[PDB]
Amino acid sequence: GKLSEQLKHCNGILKELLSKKHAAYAWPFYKPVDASALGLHDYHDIIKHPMDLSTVKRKMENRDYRDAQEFAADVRLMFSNCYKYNPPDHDVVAMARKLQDVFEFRYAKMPD
Ligand SMILES: CC(=O)Nc1ccc(C(=O)NCCc2c[nH]cn2)cc1OCc1ccccc1
């Protein structure tokens, strides 16, 4: 089916985002932001819906995502949180923009 095939493409993208190829800029997005550990005591006041690649992986493994659009919304939420919280000149934003470039160009190659 179309939904299964498109979710296979989504799973391929997710594997790539977690791969050593992209680790130099992907690593801040591997696990939930530990706001308390990083001293970001305003993070959960500013970010209402935290998202990270480990949460996307768990949701994929649990068959939570019903279609490619739902998967993409979580990956883009993760990037949007980074752009909302951080000043645009911060290193983590540069890393987000590079990983989102990887994501958007491969997401565009969706079979349909
Ligand atoms: C996903 C996300 O937004 N993460 C982060 C947000 C704010 C800070 C944070 O502490 N910001 C203020 C201090 C700072 C600036 N540049 C690095 N640390 C560090 C963050 O992730 C860890 C990190 C560390 C080093 C480089 C990239 C990501």
Swiss-Prot record:
Residues covered by the Bromo domain: 1-110
UniProt subcellular location: Nucleus; Chromosome
Effect annotated for changing residue 33 to A: Abolished binding to histone H4 acetylated at 'Lys-12' (H4K12ac)
Note, other: Some specific inhibitors of BRD2 that prevent binding to acetylated histone are promising therapeutic molecules for the treatment of cancers or inflammatory diseases. ABBV-744, a small molecule, has been tested on tumors with success: ABBV-744 antiproliferative activity is mainly restricted to cell lines of acute myeloid leukaemia and prostate cancer and is able to displace BRD4 from chromatin. GSK046 (iBET-BD2), which specifically inhibits the second bromo domain, is a promising therapeutic small molecule for the treatment of inflammatory and autoimmune diseases.
Family the UniProt entry places it in: Belongs to the BET family.
Domain comment as written in the entry: The first bromo domain specifically recognizes histone H4 acetylated at 'Lys-12' (H4K12ac). It also specifically binds histone H4 acetyl-methylated at 'Lys-5' and 'Lys-12' (H4K5acme and H4K12acme, respectively). The second bromo domain recognizes and binds histone H4 acetylated at 'Lys-5' and 'Lys-12' (H4K5ac and H4K12ac, respectively).
Job description of the protein: Chromatin reader protein that specifically recognizes and binds histone H4 acetylated at 'Lys-5' and 'Lys-12' (H4K5ac and H4K12ac, respectively), thereby controlling gene expression and remodeling chromatin structures. Recruits transcription factors and coactivators to target gene sites, and activates RNA polymerase II machinery for transcriptional elongation.
Assembly behavior: Homodimer. Interacts with E2F1. Interacts with (acetylated) STAT3; promoting STAT3 recruitment to chromatin. Interacts with CTCF; promoting BRD2 recruitment to chromatin.
Name of the protein in its database record: Bromodomain-containing protein 2
Naturally occurring in which organism (per UniProt): Homo sapiens
Gene name, Swiss-Prot/TrEMBL: BRD2
First-to-last residue of the parent protein present: 344 to 455 of 801
